[PDB]
Design a protein around this ligand. Structure first.
Ligand SMILES: O=C(Nc1cccc(-c2nnn[nH]2)c1)c1cc(-c2nnn[nH]2)cc(C(F)(F)F)c1
Ligand SMILES: O=C(Nc1cccc(-c2nnn[nH]2)c1)c1cc(-c2nnn[nH]2)cc(C(F)(F)F)c1
Length: 263
């Protein structure tokens, strides 16, 4: 069947000229709303959540791991390094790198997380360990953001990412203190006010991670605490047919607004 909400999302998608993927989990009743929920989309920087969570999992058996220093050399700088560039010829801890990756979307910080896990396949292995059979990370920053249509590398589906985000932030994929740390980091994101958040009532609290890349790809994944009801998880992925397309954070906000109306 096609629901009213799905019809509105289709109309939004038609006007946008791109391809929109949405998955909502309402944890009050565990019901789901999906639009292209099983199609693959490039994750771009939304993958930083999985990398940070994989390092948090490692820290469960190493109480000092998050204080471990990592050398930042000039050659490590990639294309967007707002935090890491201040520490060239110095060090950052794994906690500092996780915070920079999640809250500022620092690409050098993400590469240090990937390296701590043994490469992109270490991130994928963690996804499999927590029940995500769909996620795949194949490349490092910045090339994981090429976002070429039809390319399977560095992709997931909206359904799989919403399930994983729920398990990481509201479930038991992580230990209790690690889950709390992930939630704190997401709630302090600096990059999200124009994306899912912009489509929701201002009284709600949101923790989110954005992404963007080639082909006008514009993404956001969020855990949402609405006023007076159980939390939601919402994934909004969007990509366009031409390599140089302009990003459309407003489309993610519009999708979130349609979802919120339908609750
Ligand atoms: O690294 C990129 N982007 C980036 C970097 C840091 C944070 C975020 C972000 N965080 N949250 N939202 N965006 C996004 C990036 C962008 C493009 C692009 N854009 N347009 N056309 N090509 C192409 C590439 C590459 F290398 F694959 F060719 C990389
Ligand atoms: O820094 C960014 N991107 C980037 C970086 C380096 C190279 C290229 C590139 N390569 N080729 N063409 N551009 C593009 C970037 C983009 C967005 C965004 N844009 N639209 N919606 N969100 C958001 C963020 C952040 F971090 F603030 F969340 C960063």
């Amino acid at each position: 069947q096609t629901s009213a909400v799905q019809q509105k999302l289709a109309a939004l998608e038609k006007s946008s000229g791109g391809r929109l993927g949405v998955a909502l989990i309402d944890t009050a009743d565990n019901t789901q709303v999906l639009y292209r929920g099983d199609e693959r989309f490039p994750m771009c920087s939304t993958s930083k959540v999985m990398a940070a969570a994989a390092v948090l999992k490692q820290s469960e058996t190493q109480k000092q791991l998050l204080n471990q220093p990592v050398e930042i050399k000039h050659a490590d700088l990639v294309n967007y390094n707002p935090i890491a560039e201040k520490h060239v010829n110095g060090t950052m801890t794994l906690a500092e790198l996780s915070a920079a990756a999640l809250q500022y979307s620092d690409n050098t910080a993400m590469n240090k997380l990937i390296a701590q896990l043994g490469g992109p396949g270490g991130v994928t292995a963690f996804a499999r360990a927590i029940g995500d059979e769909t996620f795949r990370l194949d490349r490092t920053e910045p090339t994981l953001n090429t976002a070429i249509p039809g390319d399977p590398r560095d992709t997931t589906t909206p359904r799989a990412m919403a399930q994983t985000l729920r398990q990481l932030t509201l479930g038991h994929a992580l230990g209790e203190t690690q889950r709390a740390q992930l939630v704190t980091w997401l709630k302090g994101n600096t990059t999200g006010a124009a994306s899912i958040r912009a489509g929701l009532p201002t009284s709600w609290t949101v923790g989110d991670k954005t992404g963007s890349g080639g082909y006008g790809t514009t993404n956001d994944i969020a855990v949402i605490w609405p006023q007076g009801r159980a939390p939601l998880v919402l994934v909004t992925y969007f990509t366009q047919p031409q390599q140089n397309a302009e990003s459309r954070r407003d489309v993610l906000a519009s999708a979130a607004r349609i979802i919120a109306e339908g609750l």
